[PDB]
Amino acid sequence: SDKLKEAETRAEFAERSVTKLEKSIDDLEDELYAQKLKYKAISEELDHALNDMTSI
Amino acid sequence: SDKLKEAETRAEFAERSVTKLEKSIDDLEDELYAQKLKYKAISEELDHALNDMTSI
Amino acid sequence: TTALVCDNGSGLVKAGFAGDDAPRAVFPSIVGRPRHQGVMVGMGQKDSYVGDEAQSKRGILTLKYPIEHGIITNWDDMEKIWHHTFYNELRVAPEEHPTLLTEAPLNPKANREKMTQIMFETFNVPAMYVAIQAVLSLYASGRTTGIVLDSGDGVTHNVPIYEGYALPHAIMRLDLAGRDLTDYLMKILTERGYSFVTTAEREIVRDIKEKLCYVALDFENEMATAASSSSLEKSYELPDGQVITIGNERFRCPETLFQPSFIGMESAGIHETTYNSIMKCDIDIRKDLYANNVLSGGTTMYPGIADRMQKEITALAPSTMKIKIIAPPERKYSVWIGGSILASLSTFQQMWISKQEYDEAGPSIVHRKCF
Amino acid sequence: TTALVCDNGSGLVKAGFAGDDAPRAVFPSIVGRPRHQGVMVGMGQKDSYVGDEAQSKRGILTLKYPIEHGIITNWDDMEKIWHHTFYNELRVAPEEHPTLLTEAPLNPKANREKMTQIMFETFNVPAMYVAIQAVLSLYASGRTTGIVLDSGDGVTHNVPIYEGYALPHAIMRLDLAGRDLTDYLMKILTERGYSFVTTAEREIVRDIKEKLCYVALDFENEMATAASSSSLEKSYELPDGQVITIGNERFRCPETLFQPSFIGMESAGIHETTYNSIMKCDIDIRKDLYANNVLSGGTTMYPGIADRMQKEITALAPSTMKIKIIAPPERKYSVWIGGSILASLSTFQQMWISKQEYDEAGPSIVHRKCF
Ligand SMILES: Nc1ncnc2c1ncn2[C@@H]1O[C@H](COP(=O)(O)OP(=O)(O)O)[C@@H](O)[C@H]1O
Ligand SMILES: Nc1ncnc2c1ncn2[C@@H]1O[C@H](COP(=O)(O)OP(=O)(O)O)[C@@H](O)[C@H]1O
Ligand SMILES: [Mg+2]
Ligand SMILES: [Mg+2]
């Protein structure tokens, strides 16, 4: 009985940890996507600048 | 005894899964660090071009 | 010879020879005289059962801890505990072994001086050294920087260290610890009908706290959930039957750590005294302290505390810094493992307070260069 | 063999072998003893971190520059800096290499004599020569005339030269430089709420000054614009988060150069001491000096100074003369590049102060023919 209780507690702890880790990794992926979006926006602005500089 | 074996197996799988998730989040955090370095460098270069052009 | 790494603590005395992985003998530090009369003759009844023997005869004893909050309030009982630890749990005479006690930060001087005087006069050790309980816990993690929150059973203290240089002006010692959580749990259990009063039943409430309580990730959501469903009610069997069911007392007992207003204490929780301890440090070592926050001590073993504390500090701290909380699985014995490592070092071998030095300067030698 | 072109400076020590384009090792000249106690044993903690190592552990050090204003105020620390420069940043023993130090104009004699005595007795070089920091900056520009304004970090001096003949009566040395600008910036930042006090945070204020400040073309118009719009407010992230926003402190910090009344100094700005230095020269070489005004030194790297200075001098000077300001992109290392060129010359190879000459006349040899 003692061993079973220990195992059950370990399982609950690990499950909660996996839930937190999944949420955190999803949030960080969202943040990376946002920063990539900003980089792409300024890169397209610079590409337009280069297109005009082709006439420069 | 049978129930203890089952619970121990599920807890061990949960531990392995959380280890895999922690490694994955480490990888993605490192990738975000690299992209943050990229944005820092590109903004620094843009500022350098700005100061060179304003200062001839 | 080998050194004895004793660690008085408050609640569990942990001892063992230097150079191992785990303490050899761990037993509660309680000394309980019998309280009833006693009618059987020749039963061999002693006058005081100490250590783990008094956790089995606790039904007819009045257990009383000799260490209240880090400080020692009853020197005769503490001497008895030390004598038991040396002679019966380790069976090594102290005349042939150096000792390395541990002491909380910001403790009264007289306590430390009396400790060294006892060790040199009664037990007559060759040489003893007193070390701050947080530096050892930093040793055990294998780091050299970091801010360690050592929430023991007597007192919770938070010592920041950088590059080996301790910052004496940033130590924040708070007297909420495991014992106050036990008393608060014993006080809120009365809301369901279970009354524990005797000093022996405090041990039962401590066992309930250890086995069932956990720290909630978000307090209000848990309070709302436990008040609607019944998925939290976990039952527990007393030492005589009559199982009890703990409802939302599960996460309300250890919540006192983050809201010391529950037990009437004014100060801020362990989530905000760490941030205050960091902010007192210099502006250039705050990133390293943010990234190397270390947990230690017994009371930091609640399931789910390493996430609640990280969430709280991330809320307080600036958004750019990375907050990482080191929570090794061997948290309880972290201080003693660090003590073993420190005693096993060759560079440390000349820092002991040799007996001839004590004979020349008296017990006040401990405050001197040999710290 | 090759010569060592060291350049003590005040704020950055620049060194390297003669005949290259850039100094091999550039690192701040600060020596910082630790100030806290230190609890980790065996961490290998040294007693003084010099050079670039003390810019990484600056959180627990007390950095102190050994050179105040050109002159050297703490000879032991300067000796330590030189020893580090020779042995760890270049890894060449000085017993087999001539050295070419540099010195500001109008400095105390004892400083120069002690410098040569150290170089000949402690490090035991074969031969050393001391050169004025402005002639080298004129070498690097490839000119042979011109009036050079070498606004370093310690002291700003303005040496006019014509056809290779220096004019000793027209050197105007002013003690306002980069360090005073750092202190003034640190003093005006307090008007928004940011307080930097520790000697370690002076480095942070220096970084703010380097990365954000710029010299305004017209001061009153900028003061009026910054007080109405908000197009100037640039933000900056401290070493721990908590970004700060610098408003009209951006162009008010380096404006002190042209109005030394801001920090209470009486003298006229760098825009008017150049004109005064020119007017002391003879009437027939003023056109050439007007046309070949040279900028050097670190502090002349502010974005937009080569236009403000030209506008000011054109306002002061007669309307017919052409005013041209030479501002090479390699301004910071101009003195060292010139030093390398001078040390690489064949005609210069017999001007070194050979050791036997020092043995015969003592340290006072430097003031003699071997200047
Ligand atoms: N597994 C656990 N879960 C929750 N609390 C615990 C656990 N183990 C110990 N504790 C609490 O920690 C206390 C022991 O702390 P400890 O680190 O031994 O104190 P000390 O610093 O005096 O040695 C006990 O009183 C108990 O209340
Ligand atoms: N890019 C920059 N922009 C503005 N100021 C600078 C810059 N680089 C250096 N400085 C200032 O110049 C100083 C360095 O001057 P430096 O020429 O190294 O002095 P020295 O003559 O002693 O070598 C620094 O203290 C800094 O305040
Ligand atoms: Mg402890
Ligand atoms: Mg210079």
User: CA–CA separation, C65 vs C81, rounded Å?
Assistant: 10
D119-148 b/e with 16+ CB inside 10 Å = b?
bbeebebbbbbbbbbbbbbbbbbeeebbbb
Helix pair angle (A2-54, B2-54), 10° resolution:
20
| CA D336 / ligand 4 centre spacing (Å) | 8
Among the bound ligands, the one closest to the CA of D298: 2
DSSP B28-51: HHHHHHHHHHHHHHHHHHHHHHHH
The H or E element containing residue C286 is helix C286-291
| CA D335 / ligand 4 centre spacing (Å) | 6
Q: Are D364 and D113 in contact (CB under 8 A)?
A: yes
Residue nearest to atom 7 of ligand 1 (CA): C210
Breaks (C-N over 2.5 A) in chain B follow: none
Strand runs (DSSP E) across chain C, as ranges?
A: 13-15, 25-27, 31-34, 49-50, 61-64, 99-103, 127-132, 146-151, 156-162, 165-166, 172-174, 234-238, 241-246, 293-296, 325-326, 353-354
Q: Please indicate whether residue D339, judged by its CB atom, sits closer than 6 Å to ligand 2.
A: no
Q: How many CB atoms lie within 10 A of CB C252?
A: 22
Q: Please indicate whether residue C338, judged by its CB atom, sits closer than 6 Å to ligand 1.
A: no
- HSE, side-chain direction, 13 A CA sphere, residue D168: 2
Q: Are A24 and B25 in contact (CB under 8 A)?
A: yes
Beta bridge partners of C310: none
User: CA–CA separation, C139 vs C333, rounded Å?
Assistant: 12
> Which atom belonging to ligand 1 lies closest to the Cα atom of C13?
23
Residue nearest to atom 20 of ligand 1 (CA): C9
CA distances from C124 to D253, D325, D363 (A): 68, 83, 65
Which residues have a beta carbon within 5 Å of ligand 3, which is an ion? C 9, 152, 335
End-to-end CA distance of chain C: 22
Residue nearest to atom 21 of ligand 1 (CA): C152
User: CA–CA separation, D324 vs D304, rounded Å?
Assistant: 15
Q: Please indicate whether residue D70, judged by its CB atom, sits closer than 6 Å to ligand 2.
A: no
Nearest Cα to Cα of residue D128 among D84, D170, D97? D97
Which amino acid is present at D209?
K
| Chain D neighbours, 3+ Cβ pairs < 8 A | B, C
| CA A28 / ligand 3 centre spacing (Å) | 36
Give the residue on C whose Cα is nearest the Cα of A13: C303
What the block records as the tokens of C218 is 């978000």
User: CA–CA separation, C7 vs C131, rounded Å?
Assistant: 10
Report the alpha-carbon angle D169-D173-D176, nearest 5.
Answer: 165
The H or E element containing residue C288 is helix C286-291
| Chain B neighbours, 3+ Cβ pairs < 8 A | A, D
Write the residue in D36, D57, D237 that is nearest to C166 by C-beta: D36
| CA D332 / ligand 2 centre spacing (Å) | 7
Q: Are D158 and D309 in contact (CB under 8 A)?
A: no
Residues of D in contact with B51 (CB under 8 A): 303
C79 three-class SS: helix
Q: Looking at beta carbons, which pairs linking C167-171 to residues 24 or more positions away fall under 8 Å?
A: C167/C280, C167/C281, C167/D36, C168/D36, C168/D37, C169/C280, C170/C277, C170/C278, C170/C280, C170/C281, C171/C105, C171/C106, C171/C277
Contacts of D287 by beta carbon, 8 Å cutoff, 6+ apart: D321
C340-365 b/e with 16+ CB inside 10 Å = b?
bbbbbeeebeeebbeeeebeeeebeb
Query: Does A touch D (3+ CB pairs < 8 Å)?
Result: no
Contacts of C301 by beta carbon, 8 Å cutoff, 6+ apart: C331, C332
Q: How many CB atoms lie within 10 A of CB C245?
A: 13
Residue nearest to atom 18 of ligand 1 (CA): C12
Question: DSSP letter at D49?
Answer: E
**Residue that has been written with the tokens 């403000």 in this structure:** D308
Q: How many CB atoms lie within 10 A of CB D227?
A: 11
Q: Please indicate whether residue D202, judged by its CB atom, sits closer than 6 Å to ligand 2.
A: no
What the block records as the tokens of C245 is 């069911």
Q: Please indicate whether residue D66, judged by its CB atom, sits closer than 6 Å to ligand 2.
A: no
- DSSP-derived pairing of the beta strands D99-103 and D127-132: parallel
B12-51 b/e with 16+ CB inside 10 Å = b?
eebbeebeebeeebeeeeeebeeeeeeeeeeeeeeeeeee
User: CA–CA separation, D353 vs D350, rounded Å?
Assistant: 9
Strand runs (DSSP E) across C65-107, as ranges?
A: 99-103
User: CA–CA separation, C147 vs C162, rounded Å?
Assistant: 8
Range list of H helices, chain D: 75-84, 109-121, 133-140, 178-188, 201-212, 219-226, 249-252, 270-279, 286-291, 305-316, 334-343, 355-361
CB burial of residue D68 (10 Å; 0-12, 13-18, 19+): middle
Q: Are D359 and D162 in contact (CB under 8 A)?
A: no
User: CA–CA separation, D215 vs B24, rounded Å?
Assistant: 49
3-state helix, strand, coil in chain C (%, to 5): 40, 20, 40
Q: Please indicate whether residue C206, judged by its CB atom, sits closer than 6 Å to ligand 1.
A: yes
Q: Are C216 and C257 in contact (CB under 8 A)?
A: no
Residues of C in contact with D34 (CB under 8 A): 165
Q: Please indicate whether residue D11, judged by its CB atom, sits closer than 6 Å to ligand 2.
A: yes
Nearest Cα to Cα of residue C348 among C148, C150, C127, C160? C127
| Chain A neighbours, 3+ Cβ pairs < 8 A | B, C
What the block records as the tokens of D351 is 């001007």
Contacts of C169 by beta carbon, 8 Å cutoff, 6+ apart: C280
C370 touches chain D (CB under 8 A): no
Which amino acid is present at D292?
N
Between positions 1 and 20 of A, the ones with CB within 8 A of B are 3-4, 7-8, 10-11, 14-15, 17-18
> Which atom belonging to ligand 1 lies closest to the Cα atom of C206?
27
Q: Please indicate whether residue D102, judged by its CB atom, sits closer than 6 Å to ligand 2.
A: no
Distance of CA D70 to the CA centre of its chain: 9
Residue nearest to atom 8 of ligand 2 (CA): D298
Q: Please indicate whether residue D23, judged by its CB atom, sits closer than 6 Å to ligand 2.
A: no
User: CA–CA separation, D323 vs B3, rounded Å?
Assistant: 94
3-state helix, strand, coil in chain A (%, to 5): 95, 0, 5
Q: Are D39 and C161 in contact (CB under 8 A)?
A: yes
CB burial of residue D369 (10 Å; 0-12, 13-18, 19+): exposed
Resolution of this entry in Å?
5.0
C321 touches chain D (CB under 8 A): yes
What the block records as the tokens of D39 is 């609890």
User: CA–CA separation, D57 vs D53, rounded Å?
Assistant: 7
Give the residue on D whose Cα is nearest the Cα of B56: D304
Residues of C in contact with D237 (CB under 8 A): 320
Residues of D in contact with C345 (CB under 8 A): 41-42
